[PDB]
Design goal:
Length: about 260
């Protein structure tokens, strides 16, 4: 009838907080929970035949994710499937620790699977320049592929640009359609330059135009402040906004247009 631990989250976590700062878990909607840190998001989706967990945070943030899952009363061994947003250390750095202690099978896009297998980028990664423990990928996720676990059902959408193998996940919670849209930010390491890889930008455009048109009632981001999750939690009754994915993707296209303006 209102938050309850999401109110505690607003009091405990700030906007653009530290990646490894401990934070409380709260319920997003129905079977979907937030189990991430104050700076890095981790999405837990519970079902009758196990749970799905998206993203791990860093190797230090995975300790907070493990704690937050236990705070809600859910068993880590009941986490049967691990998913990812994109293959950066602040989101999948502790994936190997969560996979080892839960026994879940980790699904990843081909480009992300190479990073998890090697523990590092990644020639075409815009931020190629910290390594993390290697993880065991059990399945490959392509564009439009579905993930099934009992009554749970998630569909992935290849939305590269921030990373070559970034994914955006969409599921239903009972209804409401939630979308875990990737960071998609036109950020990179100094000296990478976006305009040098036009093969990388057309696919960037293709995923952005796909994300904007997805059925999308509630928006979630690996960096919570990317979708103003804290403001939506503090200001309103629900996290769901009409045209949430349409506004977010248009904002990314605006940032991308200004990023390509810094070419010359
Ligand atoms: Zn990133
Ligand atoms: Zn990040």
């Amino acid at each position: 009838q209102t938050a309850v631990t999401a109110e505690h989250w607003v009091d405990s976590c700030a906007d653009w907080d530290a990646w490894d700062k401990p934070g409380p878990p709260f319920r997003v909607l129905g079977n979907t929970y937030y189990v991430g840190t104050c700076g890095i998001a981790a999405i837990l989706i519970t079902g009758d035949a196990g749970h799905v967990l998206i993203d791990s945070g860093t190797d230090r943030g995975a300790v907070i994710v493990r704690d937050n899952i236990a705070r809600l009363g859910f068993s880590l061994s009941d986490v049967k499937i691990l998913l990812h947003s994109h293959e950066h250390i602040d989101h999948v750095g502790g994936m190997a620790s969560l996979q080892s202690l839960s026994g879940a099978t980790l699904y990843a896009s081909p480009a992300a699977a190479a990073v998890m297998r090697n523990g590092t980028a990644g020639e075409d990664d815009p931020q190629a320049g910290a390594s993390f423990p290697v993880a065991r990928v059990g399945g490959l996720v392509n564009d439009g592929d579905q993930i099934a676990l009992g009554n749970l059902r998630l569909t992935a959408y290849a939305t590269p640009g921030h990373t070559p193998g970034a994914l955006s996940w969409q599921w239903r919670a009972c209804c409401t359609t939630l979308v875990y849209a990737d960071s998609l930010s036109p950020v990179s390491a100094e000296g990478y330059r976006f305009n040098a890889h036009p093969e990388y930008l057309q696919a960037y455009r293709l995923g952005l135009a796909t994300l904007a048109d997805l059925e999308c009632d509630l928006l979630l981001t690996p960096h919570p402040s990317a979708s103003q999750m804290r403001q939506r939690l503090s200001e309103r009754q629900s996290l769901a906004v009409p045209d949430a994915c349409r506004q977010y993707a248009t904002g990314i296209s605006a940032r991308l247009a200004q990023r390509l303006a810094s070419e010359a």
